[PDB]
């Protein structure tokens, strides 16, 4: 009957709104006002694929579907090692159904407003242990949905599900107006710079209207680990243009007239991919359940965090509704995470952690073959909607060859 | 716009009805009349778990939900090797949401009637190559949904996805009235007879009303490979009672007054688990796409064939709808199967093929631990709704121990 959620983020608000519509009382804690989120710094590039978008549609929460530009495909380019300014790999494939990127600066505050209008109890405070202890006394279940926030470290790191304990990439985002649209269809335009990093870009919707989002990932200490000395919006734009001129001049051609969407449409940072145990025990002995990035936090190189957020919240909502009047005890909490992890997120996570490492031979054979075998490119593109479909052929050389043959036979 | 389906079975009719509601023309071929199916032999024990049932609900096809008894859990019993007539393992766990078994003898004919009333073109013929050649000339896509029927061998066996080339179990079904209901909740009551076979039983709905379905699986050539000399309905009932008296007398206690639901509520047979390539090329060079059991055929020991049928048809329908006016070429066909196989059915199949083999030590430790660690029993029970959640802990000793610890910590 009464649910508390700490952290007014994508997963937490989607869950909270779903719970209100099913007739629960929901208390939510936010450490920011909607307006400060709208006008603050960008948090994400939030490219959501069709299955995740459908989850929002089914809750009536796709309020931006008409105004957000669609992302219709996935592209991959790799610089030619010899021939200057050219590509040795350059292919694209259409997504079976469109993806969309609606800035969290728009979506989170709007969902916060809707949460209130639907009877959600929104409480504004930077919550700590004391708030969790209070919630667990007055609610049948308390979830922590606080992203990369500090209170997330209350959940114990799960070392066996976390192969990394340091950032594998130095990250940056630049939201821009004026980029030349991709033709003849839009796409996430991935650029793999061997041994250096990745640049990818795609159209999106933000607070000033349609834009494109540039995403930069640098191998730590290499030429694209290059944001430390950047201090102003204008130096950020300039450093962004520098990466494209230096490593992806074919993309620089689209960017001769780009401006920032706004001075806060920028970000630089890094974090270690981490998986945590989903049940935390408070000093009183009461329990809380972690949600989405609190328990599964991946590097954004695969564009999956917001997709995880939506699918995680959907799985948790289904689990709550099926429990009915049952107790939300530690076993039910652990089982809810297990279905999410074993059934889905372990595969998103394994795929992403593999891409962070240097690519093995069979993987380079797959990326190259895809430019000549369209069914295999199509399998790569649409694997972004459900990364389970990468297994076992992406991870294993012998299977990659069998799958290349399957694809070649229907080309 | 125009779709042909050969084989009026569960997957084919669910797909066909979904397609009619989305506004397609659908031609369907059946080699039997509805009435001969209603009054013919049983085909299945069709235990459907909640996710599969929800697929039917979302199409408006759960016409029996109110009258079919619910299956509320999963149980496992193992005879005590020493102590006569007792069990060394005996536990149960509730399903998070009910399963249901609606006899195909009821469901298929009713769906055939609905298919006609919704404008489906139902054509009665035992279809062969000539019918496929005709369909492919007059339809944008032709699917083969013909189960274990003969025309299914037009699709090439996929040897790498088929570890078996012979039946691993001798099968039998007996639908009965008069069995003592399980208390305090219903369940699939599995009985593992080491080195001999399996007996499992659960309530269901058939043409004469509620019943229970007995399922027998025997290691070939052992004491439960015992249907060859059975020739009459009465010898079938008697042989069924014999297995229970000999190997599971605790279940025999429930059966002192059982009768067959009808003389055709019996079946005995066997088949090799097989996976096939989904695209078949006709003599003319045109192509057809196989569906459900045509391309993924598992032994029924895990109760997954009808669940696969529903999830396969759902995945194929989603793929058709997203293609729109696009061509149903061999690449699109192969991609549709790949999403089903890599994303889901490879895991159902690996789990099932492992259970068919003698169980390794870590698996026997898991089954035993579950009787003392309720969260682990709960994970076993609800894994039937999505067998992806068995991996990797069921298949690997080291991971099985980590998961037993996870479960024990929240018990
Ligand atoms: C640079 C970058 C790029 C990304 N690009 C993509 C992409 O293209 N596609 C994609 O799918 N994913 C992407 N992601 C990931 C995605 O943004 C996240 O994984 C997703 O938002 C997770 O949702 P969440 O609900 O778990 O957390 P969040 O959406 O981050 O919610 C956390 C919120 O909780 C609040 N909070 C924190 N602590 C407290 C507290 N103590 N009390 C109260 N409130 C608190 C904070 O204000 C914060 O807004 C990207 C992430 C980053 C960092
Ligand atoms: C003994 C047994 C027990 C089972 N128990 C379970 C259980 O408890 N739970 C579970 O989930 N699954 C179970 N299954 C599996 C399940 O019944 C099937 O996997 C499921 O029906 C597959 O659906 P389908 O649409 O692919 O095929 P089907 O439902 O079998 O449809 C095939 C139909 O096509 C028709 N046909 C064949 N050839 C042609 C042709 N040339 N032209 C026209 N029509 C044709 C036939 O008349 C037939 O009815 C069991 C199976 C068996 C054999």
Phi-psi sector, B292: left (phi>0), alpha (psi -120 to 50), beta: left
Question: B329 to chain A: which residues are within 8 Å by CB?
Answer: 410
Q: What are phi and psi of B290, to 5 degrees?
A: -85, 150
Q: Dihedral, CA atoms, A396, A397, A398, A403, nearest 10 degrees?
A: 80
Closest ligand (CA of A296): 1
Candidate of B35, B127, B129, B147 to mutate for ligand 2, largest count of ligand atoms within 8 Å of Cβ: B147
Q: Are strands B287-290 and B141-144 parallel, antiparallel or unpaired?
A: parallel
Distance CA B92, CA B75 (A): 4
Q: Are A377 and A91 in contact (CB under 8 A)?
A: yes
Q: Which residues of A371-393 are buried (b: 16+ CB within 10 A; e: fewer)?
A: bebbbbbbbbbbbbbbbbbbbeb
B342 → closest Cβ in A96, A378, A391: A391
A378 → closest Cβ in B97, B335, B410: B335
User: Computed from CA positions of residues A90, A93, A95, A98, in that sequence, does the dihedral angle turn out positive or negative?
Assistant: positive
Candidate of B4, B142, B213, B293 to mutate for ligand 2, largest count of ligand atoms within 8 Å of Cβ: B293
Instruction: Give the end-to-end CA distance of chain B in Å, rounded to a whole number.
Output: 54
Is residue B147 lining ligand 2, measured as CB closer than 6 Å?
yes
- List the beta bridge partners of residue A70: A100
Strand (E) or helix (H) holding A361: helix A361-370
Tell me the Cα Rg of chain A: 21
Q: Are A56 and A14 in contact (CB under 8 A)?
A: yes
Q: Are B121 and B114 in contact (CB under 8 A)?
A: no
Q: Are B102 and B204 in contact (CB under 8 A)?
A: yes
Q: Are A94 and A72 in contact (CB under 8 A)?
A: yes
Q: Are strands A266-269 and A170-177 parallel, antiparallel or unpaired?
A: antiparallel
Nearest to A179 by CA among A236, A243, A241, A257: A257
Q: Which residues contact B155 (CB under 8 A, 6 or more apart)?
A: B144, B276, B277, B278, B280, B290, B294, B295
Q: Which of residues 168-207 of A touch B (CB under 8 A)?
A: none
Q: Dihedral, CA atoms, B47, B50, B53, B54, nearest 10 degrees?
A: -170
Going by alpha carbons, the residue nearest to atom 48 of ligand 2 is B9
CB contact under 8 A, A96 and B407: no
Q: Which residues contact A88 (CB under 8 A, 6 or more apart)?
A: A78, A79, A80, A81
Å from CA of B182 to ligand 2 middle? 28
- List the beta bridge partners of residue A205: A102, A210
Token pair, residue A29, equals 């804690």
Q: Which residues contact A125 (CB under 8 A, 6 or more apart)?
A: A29, A31, A131
Cβ-based burial of B241 (10 A; exposed 0-12, middle 13-18, buried ≥19): middle
User: Computed from CA positions of residues A39, A44, A50, A52, in that sequence, does the dihedral angle turn out positive or negative?
Assistant: negative
B334 → closest Cβ in A50, A338, A406: A406
Question: B344 to chain A: which residues are within 8 Å by CB?
Answer: 388
Distance CA B356, CA B273 (A): 10
Q: Are B171 and B267 in contact (CB under 8 A)?
A: yes
HSE value, Cβ hemisphere, 13 Å, CA-based, for B376:
24
How does DSSP classify residue A280? Answer: E
Angstrom CA distances, B360 to B355, B369, B396, stand at 10, 14, 10
B389 → closest Cβ in A330, A339, A391: A339
Distance CA A274, CA B59 (A): 39
Distance CA B360, CA B369 (A): 14
Q: Are B82 and B198 in contact (CB under 8 A)?
A: no
Is residue A7 lining ligand 1, measured as CB closer than 6 Å?
yes
Distance CA B308, CA B340 (A): 9
B342 touches chain A (CB under 8 A): yes
Q: Are A244 and A256 in contact (CB under 8 A)?
A: no
Candidate of A39, A309, A348 to mutate for ligand 1, largest count of ligand atoms within 8 Å of Cβ: A309
CA A6 to chain centre: 20
Token pair, residue A93, equals 């494939």
User: Computed from CA positions of residues B152, B154, B157, B161, in that sequence, does the dihedral angle turn out positive or negative?
Assistant: negative
Token pair, residue B261, equals 């639901």
Q: Strands (DSSP E) along A106-187, which ranges? A: 121-124, 141-144, 170-177
HSE value, Cβ hemisphere, 13 Å, CA-based, for A143:
35
Q: Are A76 and A367 in contact (CB under 8 A)?
A: yes
For residue B407, give how far its alpha carbon lies from the nearest alpha carbon of chain A (Å). Answer: 8
Distance CA B279, CA A189 (A): 32
Tell me which residue has tokens 């992302």: A71
Distance CA A216, CA A172 (A): 5
The number of residues in chain A equals: 411
Nearest to A277 by CA among A139, A154, A400: A154
Question: B280 to chain A: which residues are within 8 Å by CB?
Answer: none
Q: Which of residues 43-62 of B touch A (CB under 8 A)?
A: 50
Question: Quick one: closest CA in A to B383, which residue?
Answer: A339
Token pair, residue B87, equals 């069990």
A334 touches chain B (CB under 8 A): yes
Distance CA B286, CA B289 (A): 11
B97 touches chain A (CB under 8 A): yes
CA A289 to chain centre: 21
Is B30 labeled as ligand-binding?
Answer: no
CA B243 to chain centre: 23
Å from CA of A43 to ligand 1 middle? 6
Tell me which residue has tokens 């509601």: B21
Strand (E) or helix (H) holding A60: none
Q: Are B212 and B278 in contact (CB under 8 A)?
A: no
């Amino acid at each position: 009957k009464r649910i508390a959620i700490v952290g007014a983020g994508q997963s937490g608000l989607q869950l909270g709104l779903g719970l209100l519509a099913a007739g629960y009382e929901v208390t939510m804690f936010s450490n920011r006002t909607g307006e400060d989120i709208r006008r603050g710094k960008v948090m994400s590039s939030q490219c959501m694929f069709d299955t995740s978008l459908q989850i929002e549609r089914d809750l009536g929460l796709d309020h931006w579907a008409s105004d957000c530009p669609t992302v219709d495909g996935i592209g991959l380019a790799v610089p030619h090692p010899e021939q200057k300014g050219a590509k040795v790999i350059d292919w694209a494939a259409r997504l079976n159904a469109s993806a969309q990127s609606v800035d969290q600066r728009l979506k989170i505050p709007a969902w916060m407003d809707e949460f209130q209008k639907k009877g959600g109890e929104l409480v504004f405070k930077d919550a700590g242990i004391d708030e969790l202890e209070a919630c667990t006394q007055s609610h049948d279940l308390t979830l922590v949905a606080s992203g990369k926030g500090e209170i997330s470290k209350l959940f114990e790191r799960d070392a066996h599900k976390s192969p990394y304990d340091k950032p594998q990439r130095a990250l940056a985002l630049t939201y821009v107006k004026g980029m030349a649209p991709r033709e003849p269809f839009s796409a996430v335009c991935f650029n793999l710079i061997p041994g250096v990093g990745e640049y990818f870009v795609f159209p999106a919707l933000t607070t000033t209207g349609p834009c494109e989002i540039m995403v930069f990932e640098g191998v730590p200490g290499g030429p694209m680990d290059c944001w430390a000395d950047v201090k102003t919006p204008e130096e950020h734009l300039a450093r962004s243009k520098w990466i494209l001129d230096t490593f992806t001049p074919w993309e620089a051609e689209r960017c001769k007239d780009i401006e920032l969407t706004d001075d806060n449409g920028i970000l630089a940072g890094r974090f270690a991919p981490t998986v945590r145990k989903p049940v935390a025990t408070l000093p009183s002995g009461r329990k809380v359940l972690g949600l989405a990035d609190v328990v599964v936090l991946n590097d954004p190189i695969t564009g999956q965090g917001s997709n995880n957020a939506a699918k995680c919240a959907d799985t948790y909502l289904k689990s709550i509704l099926a429990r009915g009047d049952g107790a939300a005890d530690a076993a039910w909490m652990q089982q809810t995470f297990d279905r999410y992890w074993f059934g889905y997120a372990q595969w998103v996570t394994q795929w992403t952690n593999m891409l962070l490492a240097p690519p093995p031979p069979h993987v380079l054979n797959l990326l190259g073959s895809a430019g000549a075998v369209p069914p295999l490119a199509s399998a790569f593109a649409n694997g972004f909607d459900d990364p389970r479909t990468f297994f076992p052929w992406f991870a294993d050389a012998a299977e990659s060859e069998r799958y290349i043959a399957t694809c070649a036979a229907v080309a």
